[model samples]
Target: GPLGSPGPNSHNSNTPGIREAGSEDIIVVALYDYEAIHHEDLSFQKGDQMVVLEESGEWWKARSLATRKEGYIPSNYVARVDSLET
Candidate 1:
């Protein structure tokens, strides 16, 4: 296979700010709110933390620590954590 060739699951970016695998800095946040561009709006705030299970293009698979609910979130809706004081 030549370089720059598409992989098995190669596809266009689903959204902006979506990082390839192993590029996310997972963290916990208060009032995590998100809206899906092609699915549904998700509200995960009032929780403690979340494990970013997977990310591709513009969508993500995240598990909520509070309700144990798993859903997709738009990349731009995720709140950014500042500083390394978690």
Candidate 2:
């Protein structure tokens, strides 16, 4: 049986930055205070850390470490970090 062409460069980066299966534990620190207008969004203060449960273009589902509450947050409201520091 002749094998059909699988297609060109199947490794194109559809999802850049962090890999889906390996970035479950990513932590982000709030760069500025973010007050969630919606109940499903998490509110946080600057320097507060949260675990990124999922990522999106303008928002992410995260759990606030200070409050231990899970909700969505604006992607621009925080910066991803590997360590908790001032």
Candidate 3:
């Protein structure tokens, strides 16, 4: 295989930001709320903590901790948490 060629399940593959669920690599948090354009899209509140399940392009499949329901959310809605002041 070439140096930069696509390898089996590399970061450049169809699935990006994919890691083991509940693993440290996955970012878990409450996403910003927004109205869903489609009927199938999931609706959520601003402060509902969600568990990121999988990532595909600009959207990520996640489960809402508050409702225990799973759905797709925009990647931009996920907030970045650098660290926790322990």
Candidate 4:
């Protein structure tokens, strides 16, 4: 088990909205990039977009739009998008 490893049972929802995955909404957006303390944590570049899958106290489980890599990133790294398109 690595630091950023996902649980045994996990699902990714591509739906568009500002809510939890598999629910009635999905919050997807680009996040701020920062220095990494460990390789297990998701790394970010200067201008990278990530799709958020889940959120907790201060961590967001997200997938990188460029690399399609998924891991837990600090909430502060992402710019919060509140809505989706019609």
Candidate 5:
């Protein structure tokens, strides 16, 4: 059988603090418009608020503030809220 394209999975915690930072889940703001090619990837516009779930590699896993969903995003395209414009 031929497998279809990748589809993003729902990693939703469904908690009130799902959007909250856990000290490691640093808050960031998108620096430019990013259109994801993969379903598991995330897309965001400039200044879009995001909560980084994993900050390991260049491709950081983040959750959008508007969607409250998780996906992969570029780390170079975003800046931490605390370190932004500083």
Candidate 6:
């Protein structure tokens, strides 16, 4: 299956503070084979916020981004509110 491809039995969390577009921290994931697909073929974006549910030694963790619910992402992919340039 393709990355970001919603799969059967795949589930997500629905809760308050789930984050939203244009937030300070986000985990932008490639929605498809980005290099093969259009440049815009991706989900999430800069300023898109997410909730850090669990962390693992500051490397990887489960987070809940808008529409994506919760999934594991590298810690480097996420930026805290204080780290953004703008």
On TM-score, the leading prediction is 5
What lDDT score goes with residue 14 in model 6? 75
Where model 2 places Cα greater than 4 Å from the true spot, the runs are 1-23, 83-86
Error of 1 at 84 (Å): 6.1
The per-model lDDT (C-alpha) reads: 0.56, 0.82, 0.64, 0.64, 0.84, 0.46
Instruction: Answer with 2 or 3, whichever has the higher lDDT.
Output: 2
Model 4, 52-75: lDDT tens digits are 777766767777777888877776
lDDT for predicted candidate 6 compared with the true structure? 0.46
lDDT of 2 by residue, 1-86 (tens): 87776757555546567655643666888989988877778999988888888887678898999878999987787888964467
**True lDDT of residue 70, candidate 5:** 85
- Candidate scoring better on lDDT of 3 and 6: 3
Per-residue CA lDDT of model 3 for 1-86, tens digit only, reads 55676558545547767776754434555457756656655567666566667777777777777777778877677653443234
Q: Could you tell which candidate, 1 or 3, scores higher by TM-score?
A: 3
TM-score of candidate 2 to 2 decimals: 0.62
* Worst window of 10 by summed lDDT in candidate 1: 28-37
| Clash pairs, model 4 backbone | 17-26, 31-78, 32-77
lDDT of 2 at 29: 87
Provide the lowest-lDDT 10-residue window in model 5: 13-22
lDDT of each residue in 1-86, candidate 1, tens digit only = 65786559756856787666856646545344443336643446643466666776555667666777777655455543442254
